[PDB]
Amino acid sequence: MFKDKVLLITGGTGSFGNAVLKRFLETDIKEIRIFSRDEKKQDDMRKKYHSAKLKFYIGDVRDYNSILNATRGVDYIYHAAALKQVPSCEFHPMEAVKTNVLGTENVLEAAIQNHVKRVVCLSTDKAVYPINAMGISKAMMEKVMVAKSRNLEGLDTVICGTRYGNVMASRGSVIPLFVDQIRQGKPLTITDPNMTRFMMTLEDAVDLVLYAFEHGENGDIFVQKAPAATIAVLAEALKQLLNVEDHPISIAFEALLSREEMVHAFDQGDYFRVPADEDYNSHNTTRLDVEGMKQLLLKLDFVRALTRGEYIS
Amino acid sequence: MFKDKVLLITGGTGSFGNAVLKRFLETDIKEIRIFSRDEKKQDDMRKKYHSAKLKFYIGDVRDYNSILNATRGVDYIYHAAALKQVPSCEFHPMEAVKTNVLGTENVLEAAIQNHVKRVVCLSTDKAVYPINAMGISKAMMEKVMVAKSRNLEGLDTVICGTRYGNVMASRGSVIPLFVDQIRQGKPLTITDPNMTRFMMTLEDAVDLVLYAFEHGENGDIFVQKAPAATIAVLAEALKQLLNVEISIMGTRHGEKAFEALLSREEMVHAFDQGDYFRVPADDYNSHNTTRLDVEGMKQLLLKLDFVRALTR
Amino acid sequence: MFKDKVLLITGGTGSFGNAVLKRFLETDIKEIRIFSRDEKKQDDMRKKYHSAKLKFYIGDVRDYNSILNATRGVDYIYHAAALKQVPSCEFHPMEAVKTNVLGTENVLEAAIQNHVKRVVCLSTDKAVYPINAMGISKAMMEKVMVAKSRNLEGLDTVICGTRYGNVMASRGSVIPLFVDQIRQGKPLTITDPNMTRFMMTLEDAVDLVLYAFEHGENGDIFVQKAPAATIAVLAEALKQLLNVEDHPISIMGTRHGEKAFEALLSREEMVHAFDQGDYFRVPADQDYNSHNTTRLDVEGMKQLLLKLDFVRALT
Amino acid sequence: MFKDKVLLITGGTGSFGNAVLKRFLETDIKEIRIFSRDEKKQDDMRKKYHSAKLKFYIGDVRDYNSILNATRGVDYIYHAAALKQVPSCEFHPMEAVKTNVLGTENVLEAAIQNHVKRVVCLSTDKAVYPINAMGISKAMMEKVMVAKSRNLEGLDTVICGTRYGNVMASRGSVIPLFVDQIRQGKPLTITDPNMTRFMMTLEDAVDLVLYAFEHGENGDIFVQKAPAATIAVLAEALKQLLNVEDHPIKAFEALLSREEMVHAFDQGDYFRVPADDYNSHNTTRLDVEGMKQLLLKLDFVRA
Amino acid sequence: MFKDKVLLITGGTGSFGNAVLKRFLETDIKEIRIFSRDEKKQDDMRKKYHSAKLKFYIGDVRDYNSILNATRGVDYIYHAAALKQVPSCEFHPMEAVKTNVLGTENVLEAAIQNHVKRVVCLSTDKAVYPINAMGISKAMMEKVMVAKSRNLEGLDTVICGTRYGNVMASRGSVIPLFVDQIRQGKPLTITDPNMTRFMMTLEDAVDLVLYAFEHGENGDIFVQKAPAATIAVLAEALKQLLNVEDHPISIMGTRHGEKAFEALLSREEMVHAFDQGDYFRVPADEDYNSHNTTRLDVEGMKQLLLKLDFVRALTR
Amino acid sequence: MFKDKVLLITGGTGSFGNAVLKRFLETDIKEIRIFSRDEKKQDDMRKKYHSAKLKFYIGDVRDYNSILNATRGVDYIYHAAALKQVPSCEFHPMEAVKTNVLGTENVLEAAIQNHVKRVVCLSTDKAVYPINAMGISKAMMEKVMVAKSRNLEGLDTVICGTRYGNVMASRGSVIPLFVDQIRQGKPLTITDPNMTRFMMTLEDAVDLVLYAFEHGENGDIFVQKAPAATIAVLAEALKQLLNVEKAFEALLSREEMVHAFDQGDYFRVPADDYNSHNTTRLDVEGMKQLLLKLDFVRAL
Ligand SMILES: NC(=O)c1ccc[n+]([C@@H]2O[C@H](COP(=O)([O-])OP(=O)(O)OC[C@H]3O[C@@H](n4cnc5c(N)ncnc54)[C@H](OP(=O)(O)O)[C@@H]3O)[C@@H](O)[C@H]2O)c1
Ligand SMILES: NC(=O)c1ccc[n+]([C@@H]2O[C@H](COP(=O)([O-])OP(=O)(O)OC[C@H]3O[C@@H](n4cnc5c(N)ncnc54)[C@H](OP(=O)(O)O)[C@@H]3O)[C@@H](O)[C@H]2O)c1
Ligand SMILES: NC(=O)c1ccc[n+]([C@@H]2O[C@H](COP(=O)([O-])OP(=O)(O)OC[C@H]3O[C@@H](n4cnc5c(N)ncnc54)[C@H](OP(=O)(O)O)[C@@H]3O)[C@@H](O)[C@H]2O)c1
């Protein structure tokens, strides 16, 4: 679907943006535009990929004119620019509002003005039953995206969103913490052995975005079905992959869709599709055993490498 | 404490603003300013109170210059301007952000610039564990109020907030609607019989706002303790008072089954101050508070004049 | 001409907006959008009409983005959002400028951007020979609308306006004040018995807007011809309909800022206006008042009063 | 009253601003700031006056920040920046609103923020019974000025206004047209000989602004009493002064409305309209002799 | 190329705008819109040309809505609105930025929204190697114009620029000063006799704009090749044409902030420039200045001066 | 002059900002506020320094309200927020204008409104005889800083600036490239052997800012005198140390050099030629002593 087309990714210097580049840079796509504020991160990527298809635009989604110019001639937009950290959003909620909410309004308005064909907005499980300023701002962003998706019937723009939770082995998460502790001979620090988390990789997320991109109608929100595991099972599976069963250990659920969303949702195989108008959480989804957890971990390249005595990040 | 002071109420044409006028207009306060957008409502209100202490300002809290201008020479502000209806905010969430969040940032910034001494912001229980755009926007508003309340260490401005739920015998609430349905001989329309609500009056909310006004520290949020009841117990108690011993519809979209005034997180830091909790800046809900039975519910209803009028 | 079309009324929760719904809602129009600021009023309207064709948009004409979003996919706009009260505007003239003038520029620019086919702007007789801030701002609005309409030759947007004065039995006007005073046994309070007003119903106003809507060219202002009456003759006609011919009347005296006649077209306008039967058309450049129009006697005034259901019920 | 004070004139490059400069530059005022958009006019003016007391600010009254910055440390403001031509305003009424109404709002807000002591706003007779966009916009400007002047009780700022009509020997006005037509041997172009205009000089206008400046209270509008003449009387007196007798050849201006006249204070040479009919037809009529004596106040005519 | 078309000139009340009007007003062009802030200058022009083709718009290029509105139905735009005086920009550099940079951005965005076919932006030699706030701001404008000229591939708008220095017999310049001083028998005031300037008439500038208008691709900057001369040679050629070969000259000294040459293309630009006959074309990605271009001798300088109607008149 | 004061650094997450913290965090200063846009960098710094004196503000200098808010209660500001990369500014000159010029206008205007006492602005040698969008934008910023510094006589705010070039062993500079190229076994990639650069460390840069902070008058720009070296002498001295045996920058224009005050180790350009070819040239021995000021170099 990307042949001779132009894709723009807001927040493209982030982990998502990189995942998308690695998949698409050497395909038949014409151009990938990276839109973000930071010139150092953009320079590093330029050198890392050394690809003529990769165009970099300095800009801020808070700035309508900026995004309006970057989206001239663009076919598709992946909207991933956000403030995503909990403490900074707690202390500067206006900043979260300006970026996540007003920023989102700008990209969509620019997309509509420039006749962009498709826009996918990335959202988080923290938006379902939100408890802090970051989560709240993402919940508000969804509401905004859905309202904006109305009246585009004559026009040729489809806007929809995807929602996913934390991905395995992202920065400062449990898996790289456990791996380090095992490498350093330290006991694993475990809060609650029975705390459950959804388990999905960064590749799975890219697939979720690709699915929404192909199948979405205005205002749709897609969620990918994901299995879950307890921290107990995660630690056990990891000690077995790294050959340290005889290794010391020292001693609550996330939701992807609310009850309300569940009653209206379409089950579409590996995805739920929530059309615009029990909970689905890590406790009641498919539970992984150690063997199934080991298969998921082995989808991480740094972990495959460890079982060979190789070390990469 | 209001003697010869100037009070400005944003959203002053609403039910809150009226309750505040009825209490304070004929006391020793120098001036009450009503700041809102609607010329019709202001005109009606002006005729109703016909008081020289009552000054009217047309303006929108979305307009910084406008609120900056009206708060020149003001000592205290009750910030009550909001979009508060659920369906309206769901279909227009940007309007809720512009009014509830950005509008609040404007009022607070104007207050700081004009050396206003105290501001109390009104919030709702729907901001706790919010599930709809209205509640989400109010939750965001609380965070902004709190964040703005820091760095005022040099300045002589105090900002705090209050949070309360639905009041009994309000314009479009359950009690006058049930009475109205009976007057028309129709069965009572109930969404969820097992739904609990805090039972509280407009008078109590004014007390709550006055309480925060006297005692608040920067970033404080006050909540008033109240008993609760199911709509079932409420409907039953009202039928007994009216001597006429129901249609169950469904739980409506974006409507919880209980109201929450403090989250689990807040409950941990909150100070219990007798009839109020005080949440300082940086679980308590209608399900686990004092539950009223038909007898307890009746003794409350008989304190409401709108009900007294009907039993007499 | 409205079949399967989308109409948006800015200021749609007002009396004009309601008259338009009562006429068009149950016709073959596709959708009517109401655009205004107050959620309370919109909610009442929604319950009142209970129609799937009626869509509500919260927004302010001061906000370009807001009206730009509400007019996407719209065919026609009736622009009726205004601040119209005289005392309120004298103390806050910037608010009048912001809503009446800048708000009008916003709706028109949005209309041009969303390729809306026709926009009719509602104006008032107070724009003719204006003496106060409300009136001054409405005069400026007409000029802004007219200037905006001289830019559209490449585009498929037509912009024009209508001008009319108060409608009979509007809120806080003379007729319901008299009816009330009669019901409560009080003498009728009259300021100046010889004061004349144009006599015109709310249905007549909808017809005027429809006329402009059908026949308007860029920058036109349309005015509907109407008879007038003194308050004396109005009071007499009403007392007879209510069978209270000998009911006292109190001559209070002339109010601050209340004229004795209204003008619908100025002398300068009459020189250029085209007589088109029941309407005048003032073309854009690129005296007609209540004293000298057709004067009604009591019998004529009674036939007009009987057009109001509010009065019919009383007989 | 200007001793060691700072005066800012918006629209200072105009004919009024130059009249004020000619008057005040060589007094004990500390500084006169000229605030306007045109670098050309400001440069010529700098060269013409070659004075260290004369400071120039490029800026637009539509730009709040610009005027906020230019008025830091200013004691007094004469607000004279406006769009004034009638045809220009009919075709671009938004520019008139932006400059005359919103621009004025900015100057007053800037003056209030910077604690400027006095602001006098210049207005026109075309604002009384306005019939066109230029006049309507000036009428709006007065209402805005008056409304802003309420709430200054805590503050030490006084805002008021002046209103006057066309001045004699201004550019493209009646006198230089008649002078030019005689120079070119052409007959005098008269629309209506029986139409009356107030007769007043540029120096008189400067006096009017100084009067309001000294005596004004919040929201006051001052008007200067002036005699009037028919264009007929004007042509004759002018033909006689130039020794070219027997040479081939609204309808009045109003300075106070009926409503204002009821509330106005007669203060000798001035009316003072306090915040809440006088026209050229019914004011003192000049005959040919009185017109000649006025025309001789123009040095331009003496030659 | 102007038949039945609509042309808009920002800054149309200035000297360039007049030269374009004198040239095109009485041709088959449909309409010329003059867009500027000053009602006085516009009224003067209106009377001067008395042409039904000449339409006036009040507005500021700093105001996006104003220019958006003025360019509806416009085919071509000559963008000549600027703040161009050196002292003025030094004390208010923000005003230079607001008008020259943000104003240019507004005009270009308006042109794109209204589907204007071509825009030519006028720039100055002071943008090459800029040393003061006026020049610095004009350099920024070119960068902004070039950057905006990208991504218009789908759209049917072309944006390009021209750069030129002072033209002969413009206001407050050397020639009308010398001509006046001669008529009053006063000696000619010369700062630095060896200072070289490019020699180029107002008509040449119009041709340069017309050329850029016909030939430009997005982001192009055109420069017209021009010979140069010293003030010494300028004074001598003029003294001979006016028949005052024996006319006193006062050497004041080199003036503050006045260079001895102007540059039209930098070394870096010359490396990338295309030679197109009478013009250089710098595409969007030796120094070329008045010292190293063709020197005019007195005789060749006479032939240039004789192109001015103002000078031809005096030899009669 | 820092005792119990509040310092705010715009762009505080940069290499300069980190240098200032390393120096001042554990002194008797009351508070250091870091104002920048990036939550990731701010978080890492919070973790790295773990100090209660270090406050973080998310904000953009393009946003007047944001900077107005973070400067409430601030005594001194180091304005170091900029876009400084050349290609990036060539393709996006409006972003350079918005951040470097309008952003600077916002900081000073907020500084004035909140009665900040002293503001020092950081500028670059590329503002002298500028040739590309980044440099042009910085030159404009100086003009804006200087113009803003007039009219402050009544107010208790002083604004001034500093200008310096690339510092030794900065990211993507000549030195770490040479070290890395030996590390990857390739001979060193040299553009022009004869090209001169001023030779200066990050610590010297902090001193320059401290100097301006102590001595600045309204509209002043300070430059620190520094020696220079050929790329040859730079390359040669390092190869001896490592045991493996345009073309100049300008700091003051001819125009500035005429009015500049010589103040010992600094030039002070008051409001209204000095380059790397004609400054003190280091030989291999002098270059050796300078390279040894880098801990990055000492360690090897
Ligand atoms: N593990 C996950 O990846 C995860 C989990 C749950 C939800 N999500 C959601 O998926 C989205 C993508 O997440 P991510 O992991 O890729 O986050 P990320 O790594 O932090 O990337 C965010 C990027 O957004 C850019 N950005 C921030 N503010 C901007 C602005 N005002 N204008 C333009 N660009 C701006 C930043 O680039 P610059 O600093 O260069 O400007 C930043 O690199 C997020 O919105 C997130 O809520 C992700
Ligand atoms: N059950 C309850 O009533 C309840 C419960 C908990 C908390 N609260 C909170 O108490 C506050 C007010 O209570 P309420 O019952 O009196 O609400 P209300 O009756 O709806 O009155 C709100 C007022 O705000 C004004 N307003 C809305 N938008 C504005 C704007 N953009 N600028 C200026 N004024 C604006 C409206 O007046 P105009 O239309 O004239 O502009 C309206 O009169 C609300 O913030 C609400 O969240 C209410
Ligand atoms: N060799 C040199 O690098 C050199 C030499 C002389 C002078 N200077 C000047 O000194 C400063 C550079 O210092 P530096 O190199 O140590 O830091 P830096 O690495 O260049 O980073 C500067 C910081 O500015 C922040 N920033 C960028 N745009 C911003 C904005 N719009 N609002 C708020 N913050 C913003 C960035 O932080 P976030 O991404 O977190 O927002 C960035 O970390 C610049 O002014 C530079 O021109 C540099």
Author numbering:
A (entry chain B): 1 to 251, 260 to 285, 306 to 341
B (entry chain D): 1 to 245, 249 to 285, 307 to 336
C (entry chain A): 1 to 286, 307 to 335
D (entry chain E): 1 to 249, 259 to 285, 307 to 333
E (entry chain C): 1 to 285, 306 to 336
F (entry chain F): 1 to 245, 259 to 285, 307 to 334
Sentences copied from the publication:
We describe here the characterisation and crystal structure for one of these, the enzyme Ab-WbjB, proposed to initiate conversion of UDP-GlcNAc to UDP-FucNAc. Like other dehydratases central to the biosynthesis of deoxy sugars, Ab-WbjB is organised as a short-chain dehydrogenase/reductase (SDR) fold. The enzyme WbjB (like CapE) is bifunctional, first catalyzing the 4,6-dehydration of UDP-D-GlcNAc and, subsequently, a C5-epimerization step. We have demonstrated binding to UDP-GlcNAc, indicating Ab-WbjB likely to be responsible for the conversion of this substrate to UDP-L-FucNAc as a biosynthetic precursor step in surface glycoside formation.
The crystalline packing showed a hexameric organization in 32 symmetry, i.e. organised as a trimer of paired chains (A-E, B-D and C-F). Density attributable to coenzyme NADP+ is observed in each of the six protomers, despite no exogenous NADP+ being added during sample preparation or crystallization. No density attributable to substrate could be identified in our structure solution. The Ab-WbjB protomer contains two well-defined domains: the largest encompasses a Rossmann fold, comprising residues 1–165, 200–224, 266–286, and a bound NADP+ molecule. Several hydrogen bonds play a role in docking the adenine ring (engaging side-chains D60, T99 and V61), and residues R37 and K41 contact the 2’-phosphate of the adenosine ribose. Importantly, examination of the Ab-WbjB hexamer shows the NADP+ associated with chain A to additionally interact with the K40 side-chain emerging into the binding pocket from chain D, i.e. from the adjoining dimer. A reciprocal interaction via K40 of chain A stabilises the coenzyme bound in chain D. With six coenzyme molecules bound across the hexamer, these hydrogen-bond pairings recur across all remaining protomeric interfaces, so linking chain B and chain F, and chain C with chain E. Given these interactions act to tether non-dimeric protomer units, binding of coenzyme NADP+ can be seen as integral to locking-in the hexameric organization of Ab-WbjB. In our Ab-WbjB holo structure (NADP+ bound, no substrate), this constitutes a dynamic element with no density evident for residues R287—E306. However, no tyrosine group occupies the required active site location in Ab-WbjB (Y141 in FlaA1); notably this position is instead occupied by a methionine (M134) side-chain.
